[PDB]
Design a protein around this motif. Structure first.
Motif, PDB file in Angstrom:
ATOM      1  N   UNK A  57      42.896  43.149 -12.215  1.00 43.61           N
ATOM      2  CA  UNK A  57      42.256  44.258 -11.524  1.00 43.61           C
ATOM      3  C   UNK A  57      41.616  45.199 -12.533  1.00 43.61           C
ATOM      4  N   UNK A  58      40.371  45.587 -12.275  1.00 46.65           N
ATOM      5  CA  UNK A  58      39.631  46.414 -13.216  1.00 46.65           C
ATOM      6  C   UNK A  58      38.488  47.098 -12.484  1.00 46.65           C
ATOM      7  N   UNK A  59      37.916  48.101 -13.143  1.00 43.01           N
ATOM      8  CA  UNK A  59      36.763  48.832 -12.632  1.00 43.01           C
ATOM      9  C   UNK A  59      35.819  49.113 -13.789  1.00 43.01           C
ATOM     10  N   UNK A  60      34.522  48.968 -13.540  1.00 42.20           N
ATOM     11  CA  UNK A  60      33.500  49.285 -14.530  1.00 42.20           C
ATOM     12  C   UNK A  60      33.105  50.743 -14.348  1.00 42.20           C
ATOM     13  N   UNK A  61      33.232  51.528 -15.409  1.00 44.22           N
ATOM     14  CA  UNK A  61      32.991  52.962 -15.359  1.00 44.22           C
ATOM     15  C   UNK A  61      31.644  53.269 -15.998  1.00 44.22           C
ATOM     16  N   UNK A  62      30.787  53.964 -15.257  1.00 43.22           N
ATOM     17  CA  UNK A  62      29.481  54.394 -15.736  1.00 43.22           C
ATOM     18  C   UNK A  62      29.501  55.904 -15.914  1.00 43.22           C
ATOM     19  N   UNK A  63      29.110  56.366 -17.094  1.00 40.19           N
ATOM     20  CA  UNK A  63      29.116  57.787 -17.411  1.00 40.19           C
ATOM     21  C   UNK A  63      27.771  58.384 -17.031  1.00 40.19           C
ATOM     22  N   UNK A  64      27.800  59.410 -16.185  1.00 39.75           N
ATOM     23  CA  UNK A  64      26.589  60.079 -15.752  1.00 39.75           C
ATOM     24  C   UNK A  64      26.843  61.523 -15.379  1.00 39.75           C
ATOM     25  N   UNK A  65      26.228  61.988 -14.290  1.00 41.87           N
ATOM     26  CA  UNK A  65      26.486  63.350 -13.834  1.00 41.87           C
ATOM     27  C   UNK A  65      27.945  63.524 -13.440  1.00 41.87           C
ATOM     28  N   UNK A  66      28.504  62.553 -12.726  1.00 39.85           N
ATOM     29  CA  UNK A  66      29.924  62.564 -12.403  1.00 39.85           C
ATOM     30  C   UNK A  66      30.706  62.174 -13.648  1.00 39.85           C
ATOM     31  N   UNK A  67      31.499  63.106 -14.168  1.00 39.62           N
ATOM     32  CA  UNK A  67      32.146  62.913 -15.457  1.00 39.62           C
ATOM     33  C   UNK A  67      33.519  62.263 -15.359  1.00 39.62           C
ATOM     34  N   UNK A  68      33.994  61.934 -14.161  1.00 43.11           N
ATOM     35  CA  UNK A  68      35.342  61.419 -13.985  1.00 43.11           C
ATOM     36  C   UNK A  68      35.330  60.149 -13.151  1.00 43.11           C
ATOM     37  N   UNK A  69      36.235  59.235 -13.495  1.00 42.83           N
ATOM     38  CA  UNK A  69      36.432  58.001 -12.755  1.00 42.83           C
ATOM     39  C   UNK A  69      37.920  57.802 -12.521  1.00 42.83           C
ATOM     40  N   UNK A  70      38.252  57.173 -11.399  1.00 43.42           N
ATOM     41  CA  UNK A  70      39.634  57.016 -10.959  1.00 43.42           C
ATOM     42  C   UNK A  70      39.957  55.532 -10.900  1.00 43.42           C
ATOM     43  N   UNK A  71      41.040  55.138 -11.560  1.00 38.71           N
ATOM     44  CA  UNK A  71      41.575  53.785 -11.468  1.00 38.71           C
ATOM     45  C   UNK A  71      42.861  53.848 -10.658  1.00 38.71           C
ATOM     46  N   UNK A  72      42.856  53.251  -9.464  1.00 35.96           N
ATOM     47  CA  UNK A  72      44.039  53.222  -8.570  1.00 35.96           C
ATOM     48  C   UNK A  72      44.853  51.972  -8.888  1.00 35.96           C
ATOM     49  N   UNK A  73      46.051  52.124  -9.444  1.00 42.38           N
ATOM     50  CA  UNK A  73      46.917  51.002  -9.792  1.00 42.38           C
ATOM     51  C   UNK A  73      47.662  50.570  -8.535  1.00 42.38           C
ATOM     52  N   UNK A  74      47.393  49.388  -7.991  1.00 47.64           N
ATOM     53  CA  UNK A  74      48.062  48.985  -6.754  1.00 47.64           C
ATOM     54  C   UNK A  74      49.524  48.655  -6.996  1.00 47.64           C
ATOM     55  N   UNK A  75      50.305  48.744  -5.925  1.00 46.58           N
ATOM     56  CA  UNK A  75      51.731  48.438  -5.980  1.00 46.58           C
ATOM     57  C   UNK A  75      51.901  46.945  -5.747  1.00 46.58           C
TER      58      UNK A  75
END
Ligand SMILES: CN1CCN(Cc2ccc(NCc3ccccc3F)cc2)CC1
Ligand SMILES: CN1CCN(Cc2ccc(NCc3ccccc3F)cc2)CC1
Lengths: 278, 57, 250, 177, 278, 250, 57
Positions: D92-110
């Motif tokens: 499980x992974x997410x690709x984070x793009x840096x732009x106007x929104x300065x924050x990204x959230x990774x939800x670790x599933x149970x």
């Protein structure tokens, strides 16, 4: 009339499929001071799950609803020093570390109290121990602030007429009592960032608001031919609790019973490098 | 003057009676059967409501 | 904003805060094979989620002298997760794809890339009347380099960039599904390629369904900066994949 | 770390090997040194069992002209932690793009075999690993710093829970105060 | 409202007469893994009999609903060795043979627990025994896994603030408490055919799933001039029991507290010959 | 006739013209995990047909001196087709099984075999207080031999047949699901084992769900024939298999 | 909130009251009054039902 009669599980996961749209739940901005409310269903495909877990054991009522020792002291039935035959303790919850830290997670508290006393006795060592003594009896006296204070075991003040007291005999169950909310203010305050005098001088800190009184204990009339030592432990158990304004838990070890003084401590432990995971 | 209420059990697979003997409410037993909670106070202290789907700014 | 896109396949998610619209093949969305169009009799296997997820296919370096690159599918994913294993163990396969190309640079860099998926991209050898092996045109996920000058080695494909190795004008590739990455206003291109072939299913180890090509049409340029190259990453996600005819592993 | 505050900043550089790991850590919220003293770890240390998902939020504190992409992946329990980006991207992974929104959230599933896990985690109740890798690299224009930093935030989702109250081991005394 | 109100005998024999037909209830085939359901009425003439026998006492609830000792240990009120003045026992049901065998007839169990403690004391022999000591008091503390562990009788950890504990005085009834189902899984497992590490290495067997915690006991403050020894016995009594997947009873004697190791044993005893019946 | 049975799983079929009834676990048929009983949140993968099919696990030789054999699952199928690959790539697994044992001989041979599936078949070492590796009790599909005499080597399990390596009476194994192969009237035994464990799912590389055991209770015997041994074959087919928590391959 | 139920006696030749005092169901007394049972699970685990009178095969 004869009888009058008188559960909230955690949120369930919901089936989520593939998505491709302009909505971006993953992206947010922490600068607002707002914690994101995203859920795993919003970033990955998930199955439907019913959760029966409950947060019953995390309630403040249950978290603080455990009796904890707050003070222990020793007094002798007979000795040369008058001050050594009875105890005199100003009430305060800062003496023992564990319950102090437990309470210090909140700024203001309001609760009823349940007090239990555990008393044990033992014969002091000596060259001659052969004696016969009937069961001992103990007296616990509570003196609100400003009341008379006994100066010796056989003082007149021990004839309480208004001060509540308990007489207890060894071999029975521990003594117990209940105490309502007895603060002049609307709630107990664990911290007080202020002074005593209006000119910003004098005592500083939570020591200023501690005016709960004293507790005294003695052997009723026991006076053995040989010394006997007794120990008393006091346990507090909050009931009907309410709390306000949570605070971060303390990181540094306590060093004073009436101050916040401390020594700087590292944030946490170290590891070989930022990539070490073994 | 007896209260009858349910006791903690399990999801898939139960009454007790209580009576008060003392005249002071401080003497009652702990009321540890309440489970209401609301975290929005500490997690969403903002003035304008923000929709999770929409961009933050 | 319309410059923000999010894509979620399987247990992987892609977020872009600076992107253009999404191009959908020939207007056809990927879908499973219908009952009245199939030919094989036995039950297929649909390993959804296990196979339908993003797979970062390595990364290249964009220099001032770069000429272009190409990848061939599905051979590029021949050894990527359960997709590769299922490819190995089954005789027939069928799946669409979602291609996402990432390339970011400051507002002081300039350049333009063409991202295009060429179905049936047959290529001619460097020397007319001279055969090549299946190693000068595809060797797993590794990218192959186009050449500015005419190729001379007889053991590899004609890499003349202006002819695209297919003996056609490079400027006419716009006909195929494509997008442009202009550093002025874009950082990523997304193309949803449906399954295109003359037969309902085909062996995925013998046939290259389509070829991806990335060609710098305006060479990268910059001045007085510590950044010496702009890395470029490709990510691909099979969609509605179903296999058939299980057998020993190739 | 001669400077304690340095522990909160994850370094980042402009010219990095095409693929390079940014950081790696074990997912032991109640036992790992990283999560031991956080606002979440402190609460857990008063209990014995825990369950539910977790949120990890990353914020980029670089310049406004800087840009980049990062891959953040969570690898469930296994015999070996990932060593390269190709290994990591399978989980499980997410690709984070840096732009106007300065924050990204990774939800670790149970993802666990048992309804609950021990706070004093052992081999039986492992939880996996979390790692971050360069996706494209960080590019900066002229006249900007050559280095940047990232910060991480930890919190629990709405399905988190704890049980079996216990006494925390972080605080101790030898004599009466 | 004031009151709300809330048996299965064995099967009866039925009269059977002479028969002569093609049906053959006596003949069957065990190869199917099916146990024949024949009854005496199907092979011999029988009279009508009403049975009032009931299988009430064979229920799993009653079979396991008996308190059994699981651990016993001795500690002294005073001695030179610090480790010898208190007990520290990791909870496990494999220490005592009888209850171990009783539990090991099922693979998975799920039940509530009732714990009772029996404590007795005796004066150690010596050249001088003349002394007078008041009644003793004992403390029992339960530490869930990962909690702090005391290292001496007078350690700070004995001031439990969250860890449940019981204080008991000699001469009264034995202490008792109830414990709910506290397993992380859906049921207790007596056996576990597996390893700890995912590479099939490390600990093997039911030792891997034993993480129930510890129990500590001490004399509250008693310290006699002469040594006094105390013994504590722990009794478990399952309640509300459910069981799954029965197993054959163990034939070989136990030899380890955390393993199934054994020595080969004969199937049964012998007799003179196959015809001896005397 | 009731002595004829046919079973069809995936792309494989089993036909027996001489067999007894079919034993179904504890009366419970294998089934998928329900929504109200699961614990993991992400979507599972159900590779039906690809994984739900028969797999012949090698073959042994039954001699006059044979004592018995055992196999452990699912480790026995650790490297068998796509089942093994999916086992390797996923953290959690869950599946029932259908076990079919074949053993045929003429009407002049005599012997009796006990076929039994022992869930949670924990075993003790040959030397009390001495550990063994995970190679003296399971090494893939190979069968392990029971011993008539008491084991002496400290590096392997106690193989005393009369105690079944679990310190219990061998004659009491009837309690577990089982069938008998009597050469007089039977040639095959079929057992449908549902998923039994204290948790909804479990890692399939760390835990042995159950052990199969084949014990000759009446030794093989024959006279004046050219056939010197009776081969015995085992075949196993996972049923309603679903995996979860994809990760790098073990 | 009192439960009234019969107690064990004999065939040819009887009420007790119970009240719960604690809020936790684990504190109740043992429920040893259940006598339901079904042995077909272990004695008849076959797929096809076999009639005892008819031949097994
Ligand atoms: C600093 N904390 C503030 C809260 N306060 C709670 C409290 C209030 C009253 C008592 N009374 C104990 C008592 C019982 C019986 C006789 C005399 C007594 F003092 C205890 C705690 C604790 C201190
Ligand atoms: C291996 N078996 C598994 C089942 N388990 C049952 C069990 C569970 C909890 C307790 N708690 C006893 C206790 C009571 C009071 C304070 C502390 C305690 F640990 C006992 C048995 C037994 C082991």
């Amino acid at each position: 009339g004869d009888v009058e009669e008188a559960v909230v599980h955690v949120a369930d996961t919901m089936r989520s499929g593939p998505s491709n749209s302009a909505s971006v739940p993953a992206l947010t901005a922490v600068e607002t001071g707002h914690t994101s409310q995203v859920t795993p269903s919003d970033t990955m495909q998930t199955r439907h799950v019913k959760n029966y877990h409950s947060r019953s054991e995390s309630t403040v009522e249950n978290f603080l609803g455990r009796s904890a020792c707050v003070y222990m002291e020793e007094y002798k039935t007979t000795d040369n020093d008058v001050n050594k035959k009875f105890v005199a303790w100003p009430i305060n919850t800062k003496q023992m570390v564990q319950m102090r830290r437990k309470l210090e997670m909140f700024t203001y508290l309001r609760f009823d109290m349940e007090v239990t006393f555990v008393i044990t006795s033992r014969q002091d060592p000596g060259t001659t121990l052969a004696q016969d003594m009937p069961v001992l009896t103990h007296q616990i006296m509570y003196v609100p602030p400003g009341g008379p204070i006994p100066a010796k075991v056989d003082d007149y003040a021990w004839q309480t007429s208004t001060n509540p007291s308990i007489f207890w005999t060894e071999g029975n169950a521990p003594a117990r009592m209940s105490i309502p909310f007895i603060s002049i203010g609307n709630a107990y305050s664990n911290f007080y960032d202020g002074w005593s005098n209006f000119d910003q001088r004098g005592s500083y800190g939570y020591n200023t608001l501690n005016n709960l009184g004293h507790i005294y204990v003695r052997h009723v009339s026991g006076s053995s031919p040989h010394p006997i030592t007794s120990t008393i432990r006091v346990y507090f158990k909050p009931k009907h609790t309410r709390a306000w304004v949570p605070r971060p838990p303390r990181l540094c070890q306590y060093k004073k019973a009436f101050s916040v003084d401390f020594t700087p401590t590292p944030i946490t432990d170290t590891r070989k490098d930022i990539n070490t995971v073994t | 003057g007896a209260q009858v209420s349910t006791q903690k059990t399990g999801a898939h697979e139960i009454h007790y009676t209580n009576i008060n003997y003392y005249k002071d409410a401080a003497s009652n037993s702990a009321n540890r059967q309440d489970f209401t909670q609301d975290p929005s106070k500490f997690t969403e202290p903002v003035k304008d409501v923000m929709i999770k789907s929409l961009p933050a700014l | 904003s319309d410059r923000v896109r999010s894509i979620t396949l399987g247990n992987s998610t892609i977020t872009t805060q600076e992107c253009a619209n999404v191009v959908v093949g020939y207007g056809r969305w990927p879908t499973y094979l219908r009952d009245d169009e199939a030919t094989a009799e036995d039950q297929p296997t649909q390993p959804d989620v296990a196979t339908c997820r993003f797979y970062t296919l390595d990364s290249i370096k964009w220099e001032k002298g770069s000429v272009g690159w190409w990848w061939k599918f599905p051979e590029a994913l021949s050894d990527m997760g359960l997709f590769g294993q299922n490819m190995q163990y089954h005789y027939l396969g069928r799946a669409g794809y979602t291609i996402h190309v990432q390339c970011n640079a400051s507002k002081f860099h300039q350049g333009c890339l063409l991202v295009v998926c060429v179905p049936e991209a047959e290529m001619g050898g460097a020397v007319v009347g001279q055969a090549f092996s299946a190693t000068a045109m595809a060797n797993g996920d590794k990218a192959y380099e186009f050449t500015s000058a005419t190729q001379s080695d007889q053991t590899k494909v004609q890499t003349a960039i202006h002819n695209a190795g297919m003996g056609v004008g490079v400027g006419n590739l716009t006909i195929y599904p494509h997008q442009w990455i202009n550093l002025r206003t874009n950082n990523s291109a997304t193309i949803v390629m449906p399954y295109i072939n003359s037969v309902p299913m085909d062996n995925m180890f013998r046939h290259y369904n389509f070829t991806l090509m990335v060609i710098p049409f305006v060479k990268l340029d910059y001045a007085d900066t510590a950044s010496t190259y702009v890395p470029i990453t490709v990510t691909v996600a099979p969609m509605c994949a179903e296999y058939n005819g299980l057998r020993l592993a190739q | 770390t001669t400077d304690q505050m340095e522990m909160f900043r994850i370094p980042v550089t402009i010219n990095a090997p095409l693929q390079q790991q940014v950081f790696g850590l074990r997912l032991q919220p109640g036992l790992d040194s990283v999560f031991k003293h956080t606002l979440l770890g402190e609460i857990l240390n008063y209990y014995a069992h825990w369950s539910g998902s977790m949120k990890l939020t990353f914020v980029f504190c670089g310049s406004a002209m800087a840009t980049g992409k990062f891959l953040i992946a969570y690898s469930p329990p296994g015999a070996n932690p990932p060593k390269t980006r190709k290994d990591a991207m399978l989980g499980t992974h997410i690709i984070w793009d840096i732009g106007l929104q300065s924050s990204c959230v990774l939800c670790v599933p149970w993802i666990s075999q048992t309804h609950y896990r021990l706070v004093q985690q052992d081999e039986y109740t492992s939880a996996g690993y979390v790692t971050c890798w360069y996706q494209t690299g960080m590019i900066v224009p002229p006249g900007t710093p050559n280095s940047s930093s990232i910060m991480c935030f930890a919190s629990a989702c709405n399905d988190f829970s704890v049980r079996m109250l216990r006494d925390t081991p972080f605080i101790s005394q030898d004599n009466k105060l």
